[model samples]
Target: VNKKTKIRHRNELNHTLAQLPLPAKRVMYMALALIDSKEPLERGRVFKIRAEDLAALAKITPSLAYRQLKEGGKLLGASKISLRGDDIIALAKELNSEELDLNIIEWIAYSPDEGYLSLKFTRTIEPYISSLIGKKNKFTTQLLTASLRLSSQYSSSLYQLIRKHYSNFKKKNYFIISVDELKEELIAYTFDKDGNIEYKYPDFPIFKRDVLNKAIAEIKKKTEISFVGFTVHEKEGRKISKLKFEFVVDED
Candidate 1:
């Protein structure tokens, strides 16, 4: 695409992602370090950071970090990129690296030419991830996890933020969604006004009889909470798809 077209596309993409949770926002930042230059950077990628590394940097437990990434981390999607170094070199040459506060033009020159894509990250989300990687911390460890599904609460916050930013768009949807729908969607981590995490699904889930057992088992394994049966509504008929989770974060 032409430079103008590319710029416009990038802006649109940012507008779309401005809706996710904070932890999910952090996931997008972490993925950039692994870019091998396979495609245009605007397309997101995934990174395998250790759970220990996340906690050390974020000053939280491994599980809390995991919860943040999983709940809303889907915003960037998996880092499914294949751009080569040469492509990155080309991107570097074309764009003003100052905008990214990046200056790896010479590195891209000497390194193996391969796929290199740059995602257009937002000011609110990208900076947090940048802060973690920018410095060393205590909770750093090797862990491979997705950005979305960090905590139902965190991701739920991002969804709410997005809705507020784009209230006009959220009014048209209506239906019972299933846990199966939780596969590849990107969500921003959510938080309350005072910058605290909120737990619970903004949208209720519909569970199939068999899916309920499986869902409960899955949630228990992730968070140290038990599934004491989901809240049901008979007027809508026994809720088929539902999910609940708790969060744990160290204050110190």
Candidate 2:
């Protein structure tokens, strides 16, 4: 999909991307955009895009873009999209993706000689891309066009989180989550070889100042989300426990 293309993704997919690293998530976004929604979810559907185009979309250097694409393919191939819990099961039923309860991608290939990258989506993920045909609310999330221009993965993840929750619950224009829970979700996809946080700022104030505030600033400037501000709710003797984000949906 082009910059103007409205990207409709499953909330489940958004949840999955929220857990991945910035580069990996960007690669996934590029792949999701390139897919033809009108096409069927065949086993061998080939989604291809130019390296430079992907680099532009991801706002990364061309060499790093190719590297990240390959890295994303490897990570996704090894990873499994497990459909568990009532929420995801309902999502699968709505999207008609029951068979993809535990799914994995087949592979991705780039021809250095041709300067084009190609990938095959697993049956699991195909529904998220092609759910427009013979489907309804299965794809319940939308990525803002400004999302493509964002430089931070946290901003991308947070914007999607807000949109997903707001769409699911009509009465709620905002969403709240425990600070610890939010931190875990933000860093879930990133880990070192020894299985530790890549960047450890365990101090809540520093974490909030460095990560949360920065993401909020970027999302407000770059996305369709009308982010007014957030208030930190305290618990356990004045310790920050929850964050309540107040926002509005922009008319497109």
Candidate 3:
């Protein structure tokens, strides 16, 4: 492919679902980074990663890393990624491929004797990730690294959503997205008494003060792409309706 064409193709591969905790996300990123892109995704395809690399990436000690990985494994195995059918169709069209759904992983296994971790991506979502390796196609890798370095899932999701569209080196570093869209995209839910899923922060004030503010603080502190901060945009007179996020590159 031509350079321009390849870049376009790279952008089409962007997608994510399932809100994993920090440790699981760290392990997932490390495993994906270590995979062989030349190979295709299969039911039991395994990626092995060193304990040391995982620890350094998460900024935790080796012992903590081991325990976290074990816990992360259990959480990941039980988690399912849910997406709208229309969104799936849209992504399939964008990538020019069919059946491109992704659920983070099937399971994670750690070997203390070998000092390495192994993980398998779900058969549904492996190919898209496998295609996103190398200098020309490192979008997911960059986002995953940034996400794992942070403390909050909200911050990670926000970072990924922004990085999906903007570049760190770009002069234009600000983007405005609807508050509803941000909540819909980043927030995951839990089941209720009658087996119904409910939004975690349904109230606008609470969502902003608790989730949005906390995420901003974490992203600023932990990630390389710093931000001046974010502001709220209101519609219909005095209702918080949108968010304007200002991004910055932290200077050394």
Candidate 4:
């Protein structure tokens, strides 16, 4: 094309972008700007790509996405929404029905535990796939604070693996605690002094009578049959603590 024609094309693109709201345009500009070696047209093809593939196309490290429905809802007041390849295609179909507001919604499509250093989300932009990336985990757990990085795919398998580990720990007479199962913001696993398994979370303030009551209540319920090693009591401290026990129920 002649220089005049090329100038006109560039002007038209800019004009179209100018009509977009700032946030929408920001998403657009970010996607195009992050393209490493190719023009926007080639980069556009890379849009809607998988988190891993998108990072690869952009020549950056990729973060993995997880199904964090309950986890996100509790902390951010936002529903957890994760999608894979087919889901993305289905979402594109929905986007075709109407103009979507790209600002008010979040793209909970990636997490730090999945190996990327930041959290990320994907939003829709007409014919393009737009996403926002952040540096926080589902529970505001900073990426740097994560002691473990889980693969975004196949977490169910990971859960089973953890359960297996817990089972082995139980055989050694060490009780385990699981804060995640309690739907706490900060989930963790812990082992008692006798090499037992335990889980802990910042779910309760150590000083709250009700929190201590709840722990005692749960233990009573779990150990109604044979209470071997289970107890809950408050200690002198400036923090709340979860009760830990050394017994196997439900095979773990």
On lDDT, the candidate that comes out on top is: 2
Candidate 4 local lDDT, 1-252, one digit each (tens):
111110111111222332333223223333333333112233224322133432332233433122222132223223223233474565567556445343323432323344321223334422232222221111111011010122211221222222222324234333344324332211133466798545443344432233333433443342221232433434437542334544342321
Q: For every model in order, what is the number of clashing pairs? A: 73, 1, 0, 13
What stretches of model 1 exceed 4 Å from their correct place?
1-121, 124-207, 236-252
TM-score of 4: 0.20
Model 2's alpha-carbon lDDT is 0.66
Residue 81 displacement in candidate 4 (angstroms): 15
Provide the overall lDDT of each model, using Cα atoms, as 2-decimal numbers.
0.33, 0.66, 0.62, 0.29
Off by over 4 Å in 3: 1-18, 36-45, 90-108, 132-145, 188-197, 250-252
Supply candidate 2's per-residue lDDT for 235.
66
Which candidate, 2 or 3, would have the higher lDDT against the true structure? Answer: 2
Candidate 1 global lDDT: 0.33
Q: Scored by Cα lDDT, where does model 3 land?
A: 0.62
- Number of the candidate with higher lDDT, 3 or 4: 3
Ranking of models by lDDT: 2, 3, 1, 4
For model 2, residues 204-225, the per-residue Cα lDDT tens digits are: 7898788888888888888777
